[PDB]
Ligand binder design. Structure first.
Ligand SMILES: *[C@@H]1O[C@H](CO)[C@@H](O)[C@H](O)[C@H]1NC(C)=O
Lengths: 50, 50
C-alpha cells in the first residue's frame, strides 16, 4: 500500500564519469492525487562562462 | 599500485592544502620540476591527478 521507485533507466553506459555531486537523502510524497493541482515549479537554466 | 598499472585519482572541486605538503618534515625531498614550490596557494588550477 505504497509507491516504490524501481526503474532507474536514466543512464545505461556507465563510462568514466567526471566530478559528481550528491545531496542530503530524503523521501518525497510519492502518491497520485486527483482533482486540481496545488503548486508549480520553475527552473531557469543558463550556461555563461562555464 | 605499481608502474605497470598506476592508479589515477580525479580530485576536483575542493580547496587544496599545499601548506601541509610544503612543511611536513616527512618526505625526503620536494625537488619538483614544474612551478616554484613557494606561493603555490596563489595559483589556481582546474583539475589535479593523483
Ligand atoms: C574516458 O576516457 C577516454 C579515453 O581516454 C577519454 O577520451 C574520455 O574523455 C574519458 N571520459 C571522461 C574523462 O569523461
Amino acid at each position: 500500500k505504497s509507491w516504490m521507485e524501481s526503474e532507474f533507466r536514466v543512464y545505461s553506459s556507465a563510462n568514466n564519469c567526471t566530478f559528481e555531486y550528491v545531496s542530503q537523502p530524503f523521501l518525497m510524497d510519492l502518491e497520485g492525487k486527483q482533482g486540481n493541482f496545488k503548486n508549480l515549479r520553475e527552473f531557469v537554466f543558463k550556461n555563461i562562462d562555464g | 599500485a605499481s608502474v605497470y598499472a598506476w592508479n589515477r585519482k580525479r580530485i576536483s572541486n575542493c580547496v587544496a592544502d599545499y601548506s601541509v605538503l610544503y612543511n611536513s618534515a616527512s618526505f625526503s625531498t620536494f625537488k619538483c620540476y614544474g612551478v616554484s614550490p613557494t606561493k603555490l596557494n596563489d595559483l589556481c588550477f582546474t583539475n589535479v591527478y593523483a
